[PDB]
Amino acid sequence: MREVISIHVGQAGIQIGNACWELFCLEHGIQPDGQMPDAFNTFFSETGAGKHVPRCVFLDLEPTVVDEVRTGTYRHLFHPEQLISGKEDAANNFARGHYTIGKEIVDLSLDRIRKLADNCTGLQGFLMFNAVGGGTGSGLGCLLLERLSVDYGKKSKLNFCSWPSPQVSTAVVEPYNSVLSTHSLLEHTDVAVMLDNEAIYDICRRNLDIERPTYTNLNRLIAQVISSLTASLRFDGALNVDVTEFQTNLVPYPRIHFMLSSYAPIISAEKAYHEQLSVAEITNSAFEPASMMAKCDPRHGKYMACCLMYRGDVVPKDVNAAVATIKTKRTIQFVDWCPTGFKCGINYQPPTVVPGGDLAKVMRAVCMISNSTAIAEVFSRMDHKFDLMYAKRAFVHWYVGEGMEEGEFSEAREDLAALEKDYEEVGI
Amino acid sequence: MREIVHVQGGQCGNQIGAKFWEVISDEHGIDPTGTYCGDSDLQLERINVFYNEATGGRFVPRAILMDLEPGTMDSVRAGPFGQLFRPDNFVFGQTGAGNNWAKGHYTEGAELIDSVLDVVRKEAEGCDCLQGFQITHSLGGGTGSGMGTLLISKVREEYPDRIMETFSVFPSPKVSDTVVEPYNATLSVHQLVENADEVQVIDNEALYDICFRTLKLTTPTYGDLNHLVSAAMSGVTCCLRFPGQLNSDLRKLAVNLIPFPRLHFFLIGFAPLTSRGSQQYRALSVPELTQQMFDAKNMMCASDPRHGRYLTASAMFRGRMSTKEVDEQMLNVQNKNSSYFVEWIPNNMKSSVCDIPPKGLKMSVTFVGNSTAIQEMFKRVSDQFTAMFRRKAFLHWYTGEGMDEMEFTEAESNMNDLVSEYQQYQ
């Protein structure tokens, strides 16, 4: 029937989707050899008798994480050559992932999405998980995104990109990858959700009270967010909103499709014992700047669109009261031409818990996705940081000798600056 | 009832027939010592089509094994299912055909004629009515090509109103064992066009290549090479021993395929051939088989039908499966492969629901197809002939046993007159 297709590009896209697919198979209760001891139809295809196979592609040019999943616990969950591995990395470059080593792998991945989308009609969209910071994630990710944009023109693409952060980058050529990636990611994707790193790490410090988590807890939290976002697609509820009715609410102009998100409550076994979490206070914690996973303070921002999907037992009566409390709050600001900026979605099924994770199970939670004006300073920081190393040609000889031309750096300057001026002309 | 008479010819024919008698035997559920095991009416009610009684309930196949060297026949008594055949059904050659068509057909094979007729007529007239024959032989060597085509040149004019299907293993463009390639290939084929009812082309070079992507294994032995052939060997004649909603037999298969008497060379292929990694991950259904058997890359012959054009296609589906899902799904492949099919024949295909699935598999299909794509494989054999015949090379061994330069030039002239209809039926 009606289905959705996932794509994972880059190493960050790999084990983020590993955290996603373990949680999807945990929610449906399916034992991950395929057997169950029709709501799974959109994320899993039936194979034979009782077996279910994920509808996703794994894609990274090194085999160090692709063969890790292949030899790992889900060898019999993921189909073996749904996973595509290359031979050499993109070496933290847009250029290698887009020009030379991308040819040998996009022809196979295009064959895999044709075999995965021609099986049934009624496709909702695509779920691309990638990293802007990844050389393969931005390199091979952008070549994949533009090819699926021209071929699949009128289909939507939910994107989840690991944006670089102000303090850490864990790459010296990192802002070079960031400017060029959004140079073409602006015009080909339909919607992209922005996820920084130590905003989530500070989330794990503050309200999850753990002082040294790893990429485990970075990927558990991203898996909760996408699952509560797509919870209306698989599971039935009181007020269901689907993929095609997200851009109509959150995207007022086709230029602006970059936005923040947060999930509440972020609690452990110490908090579910001690604090009551009602509808009027979980939305206040969701609108707290501490829960922001892009470390952007919205007080000097301005909200313009928000979808408040609640997962778990809630009623329309008390969620409308919680909406009215946020509107009457003086510190939070809205834009004057959007009197209605809250589009609440309601599900019924309780949020799941991964056994062994720090999260304690909660049966009402808020995922909220919010287009605002505050994104401008996050990207203008990225523009200023790039300009210092573009002053006297830092790390440009790798790109030039690869096959791109000096001037694609400069064209990406006024396209990100056009995105800067677009943010400040809607913030008036 | 309807009797099919099987012949193993040459080293390749003996080895490929051994695997087919292994896959038929366990398809009918039969222990290799002769005793039936498996407890079903539906695999035992039609056993006389291929087999014979032995007044103990034992079943012996209607197969004669004929070969001019004792080497590879000693291997098939030594191997599994070697006790299944009749000892009289073997006929021996103690000399060994040394890759020469001349001692295959004229000189050394002449003294084995009076023994091979006495064993094929003994098996034929013992039944009430014969249906057809089915031989397996290769055009590469001498005891398969020359000693095998000598069988067609005699069995037809003594049993005129019958048919036979010859599964000819054809040589390679790239790899080359049996260094005297074009002489044995051409000398068998000009007889084979005139005097054989249909020919299935089987290509080793290509069937390594199915074994390298869709079955994708690194170490291909001759065992599973012949096992992939024996699937389409079995599927082309499955409804002779099995019931079905829409039936098919060999005589029908000839009537609605061959339009003109001088084209009877057929592609062959078996679907599904699913990779070992992909075994559990295919909820196998009719749409994905149809694209697999209308897939050029999955053809046992080393000819690409993108260049060619299917004159008539045929598909013997097998198993519990819907019948209109055969019908309008092939109307979809005509409407999408419009240029891949001949425009002066509408509805170019067979549909045939063999109601019995293959051995272990729920549902499958066996594709046989008259294609004009074989013209490129027939012309490279032609220029392989001419490149070595201008220099008169490798001719002294042939001429010493009663050949002629004259008889070689109607072999090439019948070769060119065989190719000739293919590019003007495009």
């Binding site: 292949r70 | 294994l217 690194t218 070992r276």
Partner: peptide, 22 residues
């Protein structure tokens, strides 16, 4: 071309394991 033991990941390692263990 160098061919190695089936317990290393080079070319198609997945079913250098399953039909013919070494």
């Amino acid at each position: 071309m160098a061919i190695h033991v089936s317990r290393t990941h080079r070319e198609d390692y997945i079913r250098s394991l399953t039909p013919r263990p070494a």
